[PDB]
Design a binder for this molecule. Structure first.
Ligand SMILES: Cc1cc2n[nH]c(=O)n2c2ccc(-c3cccc(O)c3)cc12
Length: 261
């Protein structure tokens, strides 16, 4: 918007994606900050619709949108704590208590989304932002979709996620349940938080690092950097068969999950 840019300074780019970028906008008079996602016409049509459904403390707030020619402008909560990735020291991760707290907040967000029949489909640290009190905020619903209509689930079939975070059934099954896919990527996020590295390029047979995990070689990186209490949870999350994979209600029963640190 031309009138918007007259009163709001587009200060800097917060991030760049495939079909555009997110910018920090600051009102010159009030100094209010908002994030402006600019998309040259990710599924932007469904993104807006899904964003309109969301209302939760661990999801990036959606203020509104408008079209200006062929460009779509989405107005989002500015998360001034930045990205989760920037709390992860490469090859080291972060303190276990910090990882635990973020993971609880991630579960809170995912439980909310799943409760209203929405799957994010691209959970990774780049899409987990932080507010000014370091509260985790799930971000970017460009790949999200509805997997439950009222109380009626449907299987999904789309392989749109970032490969290191994708569940193995996406490489093996034509159709699959939404919830265990998101649970899997949450486990990859937890691994990154605790070890500062991703375990594999992809969870395929042909990927050696995935084979090593399947064969319980937890004396190798990244696993050897992870305490056995949180590793025990990862053992239940990063289960190949999505039908045998831990569900979020059972994650809430895990010893490490509930361990005071
Ligand atoms: C840093 C940041 C703050 C923010 N506040 N509100 C928002 O939508 N964002 C963001 C939205 C997106 C991204 C982004 C984008 C691409 C890659 C990547 O790694 C990060 C960062 C932010």
């Amino acid at each position: 918007a031309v009138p918007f840019v007259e009163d709001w300074d587009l200060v800097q780019t917060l991030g760049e994606g495939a079909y555009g970028e997110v910018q920090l906008a600051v009102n010159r008079v009030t100094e209010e900050a908002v994030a402006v996602k600019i998309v040259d016409m990710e599924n932007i049509k469904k993104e807006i619709c899904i964003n309109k459904m969301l209302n939760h403390e661990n999801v990036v707030k959606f203020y509104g949108h408008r079209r200006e020619g062929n460009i779509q402008y989405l107005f989002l909560e500015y998360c001034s704590g930045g990205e989760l990735f920037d709390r992860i020291e490469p090859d080291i991760g972060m303190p276990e208590p910090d990882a635990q707290r973020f993971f609880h907040q991630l579960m809170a967000g995912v439980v909310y989304l799943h409760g209203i029949g929405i799957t994010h489909r691209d959970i990774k640290p780049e899409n987990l932002l932080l507010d000014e009190r370091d509260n985790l905020k799930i971000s970017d619903f460009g790949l999200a979709t509805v997997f439950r209509y009222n109380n009626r689930e449907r299987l999904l079939n789309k392989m749109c996620g970032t490969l290191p975070y994708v569940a193995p059934e996406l490489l093996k099954r034509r159709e699959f349940h939404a919830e265990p896919v998101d649970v899997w990527s949450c486990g990859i996020v937890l691994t990154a938080m605790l070890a500062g590295e991703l375990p594999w390029d992809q969870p395929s047979d042909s990927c050696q690092e995935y084979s090593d995990w399947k064969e319980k070689k937890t004396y190798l990186n990244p696993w050897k950097k992870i305490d056995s209490a949180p590793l025990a949870l990862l053992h239940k999350i990063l289960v190949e068969n999505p039908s045998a994979r831990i569900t979020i209600p059972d994650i809430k029963k895990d010893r490490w999950y509930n361990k005071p640190l």
